[model samples]
Target: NKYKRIFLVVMDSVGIGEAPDAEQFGDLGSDTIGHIAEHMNGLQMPNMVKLGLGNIREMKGISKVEKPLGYYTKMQEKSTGKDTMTGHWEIMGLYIDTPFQVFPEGFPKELLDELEEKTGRKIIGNKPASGTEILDELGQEQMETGSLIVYTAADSVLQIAAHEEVVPLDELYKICKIARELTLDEKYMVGRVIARPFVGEPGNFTRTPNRHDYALKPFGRTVMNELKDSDYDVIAIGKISDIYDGEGVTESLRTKSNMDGMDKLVDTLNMDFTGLSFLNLVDFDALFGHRRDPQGYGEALQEYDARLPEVFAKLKEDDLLLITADHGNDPIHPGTDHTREYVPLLAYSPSMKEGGQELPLRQTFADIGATVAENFGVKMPEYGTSFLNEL
Candidate 1:
């Protein structure tokens, strides 16, 4: 009964296939794993193959992972929304019937006017677009004019891209903080007010590490909060802490990079914690998926696949490590936005049965949350039923 720990690793936006609500979200064809495999010259993941990963595929690029080291199944998200915060919360047992707000026709004029008046500066480009691309197109103008580079994406966010030296990090963050405060209700209830701090000149502009997400407060509580209420430790690694606005986190670590995040996960493994260690590895989804870089996506997956040995070696006999994704941003797709897609669910632990056993087709991503709640001896949310007991 020592399986008192559950480590949930969320490879952000690494969708396996199209989500059930793809058309609704304008993300028709998004498959992170499939595309990665299709683009890779060899596309071989020796470690993943051994774990029966092949069983989870319903499309190309997903070969039947023969004799998978653990239980491998895929889960679809049923939330009405398709953003990072929503996906992460659903996995921890919160279902969203309504998605966060997104502005396709640029941010509302009122909002922009308010922002401009408050900051005493002009605002530019408030439409759905990529952070890096927009900055490159307008960073020079903003730098010269002392104006703000504002943009929205497919996700519910109000991103302010600014040159660090031009607006100053603190000033840029302050603007984002104000923007965060202003976004209220369903009209402009953005999931995050991203502070995209960058440095250097026009086309050479690069986003810095000062990216801050002022996420909307969770609509409802998650398993992390439940476990913590019961005096269990809730640790968040990588951007997981920020996505939840630290609502469910007891211990938080702002990571430097993907490797640093993994090291933090390892550190948690070495600790005496009881309860959950939540991790979000954002490189694959953030760098490759949204950018539609199929080759990079494959390399990222292979990189993590290679580290599986290290992860398995450190697992506690009863400790459960669940690997999944929030949503999909297909790297092979045309747009640089989240795709409507399903996420793979693979669980690892010495105590569980192995091989290509098909876990039930879960109704929603919240099933992950339910499983986590059940693992912690708590009540499952009304959203998704728990698979922990069944397994």
Candidate 2:
């Protein structure tokens, strides 16, 4: 392998600009990074600036450096959907033509009834709602009545929120497993069955680190599977394992927030591992984007940016680090759904010679998978053309 370890980090929902086909998704003129920078008046992420984040697009504060320290490019989505699973699967070289089933109006009565029957607990709230707000509204009720506060959102998720005291982590996890098994049917192709376990009282409810997601397996073989088959380590951090349903993952680690994810990432970098270490920092999406707080998003970017020096110091000559995003959740957009937008790609290696070149705009996210596969001499995927030669 050219690089002993490839670190691929997904700044989830950190999109640059609107995609060409964004209008069909009812998302136009939506830019995650652009809007956030503008809202904050100016954003500062010098480390990523050194990585050519600016050349990808014109943001308020992030500058287009004279000579970036890495290769930079922007990639358009090829999958039919703009949600997390589709974008992530696409990045792993799987093109999703048909979108996963989403219960916008929430699941049918029969389904909830079945869940209630199997779990022997009453179910509440079967409609789309915010994760935290729903808990504030129903968490107390669930605790008092020993019920499950089930809700969903614009995404393909069936989230069950419950108080840790009432349902217990093990019990809630078991219920999620049941939900997972039940969702495998043709009618209910939910992407993830999340166990949103929380603590505290009704007014001051707080989600715990015990949050678990039971995700559907990718529809087709991804580059991760090929890497694993070739006897390469495929480490997953944060939501990466959950997003892929743990498929082809050699080791998985959970994080409570983006900062924690970063801490785990740096720790993993210190460990000796051959192959890929993939991490998903979900705060950019879950905490900022979904909440429609551009200022928070910008500040979060700054926070994430501030930590890059530690990572850079840990890089070896043969180590390749890639920074990108899965999809866009434009906080300034009309709704809470993920926006159809072009995500940025910044590729860097301490082994490279001068690095100010910008690659052509990629047609699909699968190019990342192709490049990784090429670097490791593993089997190539069907979609994206590799840019390894360019690098």
Candidate 3:
């Protein structure tokens, strides 16, 4: 195995097209990148164009390069849910056939009461609402009463919004920890319990970098666990560490924004590591996609494309770079939630002899882990058929 390190970067919510089962998920018309391209009149991802992004499917503004410098494909998720944890879990070779609990009508009174009793605070906004909208509606009440502004969404999550001044970051995190433990039971098994901390006045409050997620442990062994067992470095960046609940991570780094994430990635490239460096740039999903700002999403993509040369320059000879997405959050979609869609897969290595090639559509997100394991000479995961030899 020549590839000593695998730099796997997930562009959160950067889906290419609707999946086959999109109808079942009410995401039949979802196309995160496609719709962004349409709205922007043309996508300006020249770096990705060179890597064959447009070749995966017809994309507006991005012309296909005749000689792509990487292997490209589209990967479908085998997991039942289209949320962050589920998508990331599937990428590491765990298929979640059973979906996590989502509270559209809000959590039951029993759960809320238990949370309040444990944290010694009242609960407000128990319904489904955008994080920002809920803050605007209940931030004043929370500030005045010192209450927890709890909310949920289409995803399987229990999010508690709090003002950092009203409730310290440590206290908010402690409350989320209690909620995380309480949701382990089948009666309330949500995917993640997030601490959403904000700062400023009620009408103009903004979320802070102190937000944290308490996620459940993985249901099964993943490539990360195997890699760790084999004594390889598994450096996790951003929410990747939280999504895995600290499992199989040799070292972890928290990032504040997409630009910060890229800076960290470049910094990590300078370090000596022999296994995997996993990163998730989340602003596309958090700031733009969920906010239904197509122009902002397009700008983020363009900014990332502009920064790709630095990433490519930092790559070692035997290092493999993989770029993909967890799921789609189409800004043009009707709601502010993830969509069922196929994610793009792009791979590049300086050691590669061949450049432009169309990899067959991956049957599952697990294919990524399988290919990485194969490259690193590690045990293959239970799912996925590797495309290493094809490359």
Candidate 4:
């Protein structure tokens, strides 16, 4: 293997620009990172600036540096959906032709009835809603009635929100597990079943760190599975394990926030491990992007940028670090949903040339997996062309 460990950091919902087919997904002008930089007047990501973030696309605030320290490009998604699962799966060499089922009008009565019958709890709020908004409207009622606040969104997700005082964490997780199993059938195969638990009074309610995601198992083998088959360590940080339904994960670490996820990644760098260390920093999407807070989103990027030094200092000569995103959640866009947009791809290693180089816009996300396979001399996945030799 060229590198002993590959650090793959996914900045969740941090899209570079809108894809060519954005209009097909009603995301015609969505540009997550671009719009956030515009909304904030300018960004101050000195670390990423040196890595050539500005070179990918023109930014309102960030300027192109004279010399960059990494290879840079923008990548497109070939999968049919813009949700996290679809994007992550495609990154690891699995493409989905049939988009997962979404229920903007809510799940059908038969499915809801069966869920209630199995859990012995009445359900309420069976409609599409933002997580914070749904909890704000129904938290008091859910506490009083002890009924589950069920909801869905534009994405193929079934969310169950409950006040921790009203419904215990274990019970909420159990119900979500039940839903996960039931949704395996074609009639209700949502991409993910999420346990959204909150705490405090209605007026001051806040979601906790105990949130759990039960995603449908991968449709086919992914790069993670292939790496595991070769007896390499596959460390899943944050929600990466959940996105793959725990497949191909030898070690799993759940995080409370994006900062915590980064701290874990920095620690993992000090450990001796071969193969892939996949990390997802999701606060950009969960806290700022979905709420349409461009300022907050920009601040989150700056916060992450401040921590890059610790990561770079830990890299060995043979270690490669890849920075990218699963999808775009443009906070400045009209709606509060993921945008069908292109994601940025940045690769840096201490052994590389001093100056950065521009890479052509990639055709698909699987190119990342292909590079990893080539780096380790593993059998390349069935998709994507590797740029390992190009480096």
- lDDT values, one for every candidate: 0.79, 0.89, 0.90, 0.88
lDDT of candidate 4 over 183-275, digit per residue (tens): 887787799899999998978889999998887788888889989989999999998998899888889988989889999998889889999
Return the TM-score for each candidate structure.
Answer: 0.86, 0.88, 0.88, 0.87
Per-residue alpha-carbon lDDT of model 2 for 306-351, expressed as tens digits? 9999998899989999999988998898867889999999999988
RMSD of 4: 3.3
- Superior candidate under lDDT, 3 versus 4: 3
lDDT (10s digit) by residue, model 1, range 220-247:
8887888878888999998887788888
Off by over 4 Å in 3: 101-105, 113-122, 128-148, 153-155, 161-178, 185-188, 195-212
Error of 4 at 109 (Å): 4.1
Task: Report how far residue 82 has shifted in candidate 4, in Å.
Answer: 0.3
Weakest 10 consecutive residues of candidate 3 by summed lDDT: 347-356
